[PDB]
Amino acid sequence: EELLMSLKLKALYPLTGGYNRHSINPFYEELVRPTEIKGLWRWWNRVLFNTLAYSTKGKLYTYESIDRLFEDVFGSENKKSAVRLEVITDEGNDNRFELSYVELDKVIDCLRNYKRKVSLDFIDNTLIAEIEGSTKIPISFKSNLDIDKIIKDLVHNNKLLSFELLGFKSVEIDATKISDKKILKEILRDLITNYLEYFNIKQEVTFTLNIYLDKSREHKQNFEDKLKFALYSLLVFILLGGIGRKTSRGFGSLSIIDVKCYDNSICKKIEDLAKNFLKISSGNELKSKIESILDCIKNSCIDTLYIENNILSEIDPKKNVVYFINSDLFEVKRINDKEKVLANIYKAVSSEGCCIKSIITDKYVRKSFLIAFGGYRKVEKDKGLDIGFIKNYLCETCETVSSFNIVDFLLSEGSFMSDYILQYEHRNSLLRFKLISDNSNNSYLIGYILHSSYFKKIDIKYVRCILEKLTYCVI
Amino acid sequence: STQREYVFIPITNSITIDVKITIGGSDHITNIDERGIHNVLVITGYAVDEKNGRLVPTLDPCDYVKGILVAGTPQQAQSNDFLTLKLPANKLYLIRKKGNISDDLKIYIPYSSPDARNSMKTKPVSISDDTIVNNIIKEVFDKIYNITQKEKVKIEKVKEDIKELFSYYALEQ
Amino acid sequence: STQREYVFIPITNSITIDVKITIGGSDHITNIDERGIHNVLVITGYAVDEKNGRLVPTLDPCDYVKGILVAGTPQQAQSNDFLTLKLPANKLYLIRKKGNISDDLKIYIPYSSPDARNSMKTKPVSISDDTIVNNIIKEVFDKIYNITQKEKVKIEKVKEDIKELFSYYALEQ
Amino acid sequence: STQREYVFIPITNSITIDVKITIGGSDHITNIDERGIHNVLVITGYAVDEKNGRLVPTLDPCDYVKGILVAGTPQQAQSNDFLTLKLPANKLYLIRKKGNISDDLKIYIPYSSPDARNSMKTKPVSISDDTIVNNIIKEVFDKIYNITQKEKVKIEKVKEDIKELFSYYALEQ
Amino acid sequence: STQREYVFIPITNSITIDVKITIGGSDHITNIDERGIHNVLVITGYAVDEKNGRLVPTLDPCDYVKGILVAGTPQQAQSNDFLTLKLPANKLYLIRKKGNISDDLKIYIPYSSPDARNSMKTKPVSISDDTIVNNIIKEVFDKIYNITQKEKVKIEKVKEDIKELFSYYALEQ
Numbered sequence A: 001e002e003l004l005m006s007l008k009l010k011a012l013y014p015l016t017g018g019y020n021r022h023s024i025n026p027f028y029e030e031l032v033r034p035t036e037i038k039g040l041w042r043w044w045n046r047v048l049f050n051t052l053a054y055s056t057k058g059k060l061y062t063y064e065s066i067d068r069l070f071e072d073v074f075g076s077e078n079k080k081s082a083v084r085l086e087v088i089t090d091e092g093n094d095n096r097f098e099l100s101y102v103e104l105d106k107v108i109d110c111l112r113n114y115k116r117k118v119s120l121d122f123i124d125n126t127l128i129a130e131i132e133g134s135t136k137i138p139i140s141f142k143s144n145l146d147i148d149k150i151i152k153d154l155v156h157n158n159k160l161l162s163f164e165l166l167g168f169k170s171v172e173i174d175a176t177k178i179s180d181k182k183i184l185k186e187i188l189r190d191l192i193t194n195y196l197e198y199f200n201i202k203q204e205v206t207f208t209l210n211i212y213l214d215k216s217r218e219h220k221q222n223f224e225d226k227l228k229f230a231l232y233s234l235l236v237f238i239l240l241g242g243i244g245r246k247t248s249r250g251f252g253s254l255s256i257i258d259v260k261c262y263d264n265s266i267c268k269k270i271e272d273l274a275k276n277f278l279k280i281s282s283g284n285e286l287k288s289k290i291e292s293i294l295d296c297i298k299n300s301c302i303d304t305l306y307i308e309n310n311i312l313s314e315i316d317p318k319k320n321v322v323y324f325i326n327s328d329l330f331e332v333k334r335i336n337d338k339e340k341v342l343a344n345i346y347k348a349v350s351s352e353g354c355c356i357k358s359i360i361t362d363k364y365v366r367k368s369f370l371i372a373f374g375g376y377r378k379v380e381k382d383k384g385l386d387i388g389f390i391k392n393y394l395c396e397t398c399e400t401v402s403s404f405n406i407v408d409f410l411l412s413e414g415s416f417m418s419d420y421i422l423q424y425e426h427r428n429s430l431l432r433f434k435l436i437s438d439n440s441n442n443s444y445l446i447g448y449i450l451h452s453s454y455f456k457k458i459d460i461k462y463v464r465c466i467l468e469k470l471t472y473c474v475i
Numbered sequence B, C, D, E: 001s002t003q004r005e006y007v008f009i010p011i012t013n014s015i016t017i018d019v020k021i022t023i024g025g026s027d028h029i030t031n032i033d034e035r036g037i038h039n040v041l042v043i044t045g046y047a048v049d050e051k052n053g054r055l056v057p058t059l060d061p062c063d064y065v066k067g068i069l070v071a072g073t074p075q076q077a078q079s080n081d082f083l084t085l086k087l088p089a090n091k092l093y094l095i096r097k098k099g100n101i102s103d104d105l106k107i108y109i110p111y112s113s114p115d116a117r118n119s120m121k122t123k124p125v126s127i128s129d130d131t132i133v134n135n136i137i138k139e140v141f142d143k144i145y146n147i148t149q150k151e152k153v154k155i156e157k158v159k160e161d162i163k164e165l166f167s168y169y170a171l172e173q
Helices: A034-053 A063-074 A150-157 A159-168 A184-199 A223-240 A264-275 A283-295 A338-344 A364-373 A416-420 A460-473 B131-141 B156-163 C133-139 C155-165 D130-139 D158-165 E134-141 E156-161
Strands: A002-012 A083-089 A099-103 A116-123 A126-131 A135-143 A170-173 A205-213 A258-261 A323-332 A431-436 A444-452 A455-457 B003-008 B067-070 B106-108 B123-125 B168-170 C002-008 C032-034 C040-042 C066-070 C085-087 C105-108 C123-126 C167-170 D003-008 D040-044 D064-070 D085-087 D105-108 D123-125 D168-170 E040-044 E064-067 E085-087 E105-107 E123-125 E168-170
Touching: A002 A223, A002 A264, A034 A063, A034 A083, A034 A223, A034 A323, A063 A223, A099 A184, A116 A150, A116 A184, A126 A184, A135 A184, A150 A159, A150 A184, A150 A338, A159 A184, A170 A184, A223 A264, A223 A283, A223 A431, A258 A264, A283 A323, A283 A444, A323 A460, A338 A431, A444 A460, B131 B156, C133 C155, D064 D168, D130 D158, E064 E168, E134 E156
Parallel strands: B003 B106, C002 C105, D003 D105
Antiparallel strands: A002 A205, A002 A258, A083 A205, A099 A135, A116 A126, A116 A170, A126 A135, A323 A444, A431 A444, B003 B067, B123 B168, C002 C066, C040 C066, C085 C105, C123 C167, D003 D064, D040 D064, D085 D105, D123 D168, E040 E064, E085 E105, E123 E168
């Protein structure tokens, strides 16, 4: 075993989770989970691979076979991983979340013989137990983690973050039946912890990502070639994706501070292509680099492209979904207020925000666009024609003014994609954002659209200059 | 805006109408056309006193007083039973938010002083014996808001909400 | 059909008035319906030159300028400082669009050319420094709608609205 | 360093050469070393009109036009159709970029005044008609690159490079 | 970083410090910031000789000499008793690792010469009798790191791990 390479990266406002869905907990703190890197690296490998397969073969391959193809690198049920990650985040402390005291016993007395719901809000460095039965009583707590002011701003001013607080902030309390205080004092006490821990957010989380090789994986078929392709999918993971939660909206965006390597025979082009991001100096100059890195994985420097192997499996378009990189939908602007655009992206992904109420100026072409691009949207098909008039935009074949047709989305009935694109509460967003920079103080927002397989076909330039105006008013 | 009155609504027949000329304009707070009583300002730290409701300023945060808001008279141009306090229209703890508010309001409330030699002993009592409903909705809603809630029939939404609108605690002395 | 002319918002000293006849009627390319302006226009690939405040074309898609299009001609004596396009506005990047513009638009944008003796690297800087915000509300905004600070409730918040909306690139040379 | 004029490639036969640049010196930007056309420059918000095509200007970012930048003296010592842009070589959009260009950059872009009193009505234009594809591969490429395209293997592969890369927009009138 | 130097922890302090100035910059490796003693180097196959001890080398992998590593100049350019080694920081064995370390480190560990006519026969010696640990505390910890250690509780804590976190083998001849 020996160290393959080292990637000193940084993350921008990462929302890394844990057992409690927060980056800190009563026991430890991890702002970077080496399990999420390995999990996302594999996700950005099954995407890049199907990109290399939808540019040289016109074929798409299922996930359970791409990793079966790469299991000699990332490992599987039949083989240990050949690469092993090791994240060494800086400041290397213990830094658990400790709640020293929380003086709350009036709100306890405000909660006898009643079924209310407590709700926490952080108003001017002080939190309030908003009993929806009209009692905004304050609380005098004292804890760690020093919420400065900025996160309190950043959370309240970002409509996405504030929307996900709706879980971690409130809970009903039935007390008409037998009640207590030793029990209520412990219900409310953790409700504080699960709330303040949501505010352990930090910009500029600097960590290293050491990647080791074992030197015991004999070159089965393309080991030396499968591996150096995985490094490519790791760079595009760094350059297009982030770690943590809501990375499809800019959070946890990754950068590159300095890349070393220790085996020139493999990492040669990878470190070089990675070296080209330490000194980015112009918006459309990076738009060239984003394409420079991508094409060197395509027809230029074709990394052994051994698709002619009996491991893969073509997908079924009417029952499978696959995400791959459309090399054309890419936009690199420039920004100087990360927090502003981080809160602006809500203007571009919400069905009422002041960026797509301008670009796609209607109800249906607006919503139906998000339904097919903005991940999964809560669309309640209990009202009138606004389930079909958005269907009329997303049919497989019907009267279309805009090209948002889905591979088997039929009207008057529901196929597999008909329910999937409509009722499946876990669907990633094809429209993504990422803020990237280092050593230049020149932050560049990046916008792109992952190409899916359920799309019948998409008018490239139309939905591009939709995305174009998008990335413009997001600043 | 300008002068406005916080009409707290218990079950009692004490100060039901109690209110002379309004602004004349319709810059009201609680209009209940068809979608339930909305923007129902209710305040904390007072008690209905169970009789001759003066809203004794209590110091229990658990304690509170509910009611409605409307730009009526200051008790036929009176001030000795008020607060004359000004609002920024964001430090008002409103219920069932409906967006639009003004910048400043001169909210006026029936006031009082602490009755000496008497522990307040605020006691929670909700709205019951609903014969008060047609007593108030005809008086404080059909004489204060008789443009909606009369040309409509969706007042069963209001009917069920009357008891489900104002709870209150009381000194009960 | 219609005539319009460009007025962006820098912090410079070249926005004095320098404008001929008003709308002719009273309809601008923008409106005021929320607490802030709407229908701001964007030209991509132009900077402000920070002196002699016309917009010189660049060929970088990362180049920002935005304002509101005032109606009318530029005195027909500076018949070369402006573009005078004619489009149905569907080829017009407009933000906070509140109206359907099916007719055609004569828009006159303060124009220039590099005549470059040297290089030209534009610099991004937005508006801040409150002394400037209420400074531009008095020589740019009391003249567009003839509605400001007479019966408004919005102007003081439009200052916040102008801050976060209008962002301009600048040569700074 | 010195002049680098920009030749864009529409369907039009007249906009083809009419040029004062053969090779200039020996420092080209759009080299055809192995993979055909590289370093393609894009112009955001400009049309060609297919007639008198010298980069007709618009404002819509949906409209974009590609071309080739060639180093030499701009078109008859005439300011009629140019911009004289001395750029810092970092505001450029080079599709298929390759090689490190210097910091200084003096490019020349064909200019047309906007069609006054005329609607633009720009239209997306890809390129087709393999015969006229057999035209441009000689019509310009072997008229600019005498030392190129005759003694390599990369001859017929520039066809689909032409077929894929070069799209643009036009007024269609 | 640049020139560093490791130094062992011998109970015999004939070479207690005998090393010259700090970085010249502001970067150490070991520190006692709040919790405990951080990065501590362990090299293998080196006995001290504890008599002008400068890490006599041997081939036994049983031997080791723990000890802090500070970025000091090698004893005002002492050209006799160091190893002047540069390493990519991956070849360093750090007990109690804390944070990432630099790209390459030029360390000068005290290197005596492997002597002849004397079989090594090294015997391990550990720390005990806490009047031996304070004879080391101020000399090499509260001198090199003589800014803090008079501000926090970390005084006895440093004399906790000194008893065991720094063991070694000795030639004992």
